[PDB]
Amino acid sequence: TTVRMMHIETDPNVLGVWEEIAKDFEAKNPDIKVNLEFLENEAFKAKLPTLLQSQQKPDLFYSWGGGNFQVRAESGLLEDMEGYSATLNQELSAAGMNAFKIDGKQYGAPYMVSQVGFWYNKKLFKQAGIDGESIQTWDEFLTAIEKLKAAGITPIAVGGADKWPMHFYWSYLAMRAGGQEAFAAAMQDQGDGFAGEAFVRAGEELKRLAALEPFQPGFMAAGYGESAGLFGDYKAAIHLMGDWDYNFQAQQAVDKKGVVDSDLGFMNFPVLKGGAGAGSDTLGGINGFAFAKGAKPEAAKWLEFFLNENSQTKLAEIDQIIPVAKGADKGLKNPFKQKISQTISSAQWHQVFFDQALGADVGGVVNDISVGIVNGDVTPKEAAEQVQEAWEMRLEHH
C-alpha cells in the first residue's frame, strides 16, 4: 500500500531526515510505501479547499489545527483514526493529541509546538548601541527601533506580501494589551468582542511602529523567504518569527550560514504599558498532520513511526522542532531551542496563531488589516470592527 503525506517543508536537512525515517520505516514494513508530497505554504493553504473535495486526496496533510481544522472535522472532510491511535497516544503528549481530537474522534496527530518571538542580530545591535537583553517593554522596543534607524540599519525584516508575518505584530500586541481574558471574550463575541479596546490598542501600537518606517524597502512585495534571507544576510536587525526561523534564515542566507550563534539573539515579545497580558504568554501553536477522509490505516502506521521518540529526537537535534513525542525533549541541546522550549512549557497562555485560530475567512481579515494598518489604509478602530464583524457572521453561519 502507498501512503501519501502532503507537506510544506523546504529545508534540505529536515527533508533528508524525513527521508531517512521513511527509508527505515519501509525496511521494517515492506508492505507499505511512503510518498512525501511538497506544496509551498501559501500555495498549500490556497489549494487545500479544492483538494479536500477531490476524489484523489493524500492520506495526510499538514495542519495548524485551529478554525479550519474544526470546520473540516465537523463537515466530514477528515477521517476518524481513533481505532488506530493507541500507539500514537502512548508516544505523544496528550495535549498534542487533544489538539487534533474533536468529539472523541482522532482526526490527526501533533508534530511540533512553536513560539513566535524576536530573532535579532547582536552585531547590528552593538553598532546601533542597543543591549538586546534590556528590552522588556514595547516602549523600549520602539526606542531600539529608533536607534537602529538613526544608525542607518534596516530595523526589521517582514514578509509583507504573505501578510501573516505582519499579523504576528498585531496579534501579540492584542495579547499584551488585553490578556487571555479579552481574547476569550472576543471568541465568544461577548461585549465588544474583537472590536474591543485591546484590539484597537493593538492597531494603535502597530501604527506607532509603522510610523518609524522600520521595515525593509519593498516589504509589501517581499515574501517570507526573501525577508528571512535579508535577516540571514545581516541586512536587517530584527525578525519576528516562529522558532523554525533558526534554520530558515541560514538556508535563505547567501552564505548558507546566516546569523551565526555568537551574533544571534532571541527575545520574547515585550510587555505593554497599561496592558493586561503577561510577558510569558506565547504566540505559537501545535502543528501536526490531519487525516483526509478516506485515509488508509497504513497512514496511521506511518505516522506512529514518523512521530516516535527517535524520529522526533533527530528533528530536535537538527534544531528544527520543539517536539511533541515524550522523551524527545532530550534532543533540545541547542541553547536557543532549550530556552524557547522552557518558555512554551511555562506559559499560562499559549495562543495559536490568530489567522489559524480564526479560520481562513476571519483569519484572512486579520492578515489583511495587519498590513492595512501599516500602510495607512485602515484605522485601528476600523480594522478591529472588521474582525469582529466577520467573526460574528462566521458564528452565525455555522
Ligand X SMILES: O[C@@H]1[C@@H](O)[C@H](O[C@@H]2[C@@H](O)[C@H](O)OC[C@H]2O)OC[C@H]1O
| Interface contacts to ligand X, rule CB under 6 A | 8, 41, 164, 224, 242, 244, 287, 353, 355-356
Nearer to ligand X, 42 or 382 (CB): 42
Closest contact distance (angstroms) between CB of 110 and ligand X is 13
Nearer to ligand X, 8 or 151 (CB): 8
Closest contact distance (angstroms) between CB of 320 and ligand X is 9
Nearer to ligand X, 10 or 87 (CB): 10
Closest contact distance (angstroms) between CB of 287 and ligand X is 5
Nearer to ligand X, 107 or 244 (CB): 244
Nearer to ligand X, 85 or 268 (CB): 268
Q: What is the 3-state secondary structure (H, E, C) of the chain?
A: CEEEEEECCCCHHHHHHHHHHHHHHHHHCCCCEEEEEECCHHHHHHHHHHHCCCCCCCCEEEECCHHHHHHHHHCCCECCCHHHCHHHHHHECHHHHHCCEECCEECEEEEEEEEEEEEEEHHHHHHHCCCHHHCCEHHHHHHHHHHHHHCCCCCECCCHHHCHHHHHHHHHHHHHHHHHHHHHHHHCCCCCHHHCHHHHHHHHHHHHHHCCCCECCCHHHCCHHHHHHHHHCCCCCEEEEECCHHHHHHHHCCCCCCCCHHHEEEECCCECCCCCCCCCCEEEEEEEEEEECCCCHHHHHHHHHHCCHHHHHHHHHCCCCEECECCHHHHCCCHHHHHHHHHHHHCCCEEECHHHHCHHHHHHHHHHHHHHHHHCCCCHHHHHHHHHHHHHHHHHHC
Nearer to ligand X, 164 or 246 (CB): 164
Closest contact distance (angstroms) between CB of 269 and ligand X is 14
Nearest residue by C-beta to ligand X? 353
Nearer to ligand X, 125 or 354 (CB): 354
Closest contact distance (angstroms) between CB of 60 and ligand X is 16
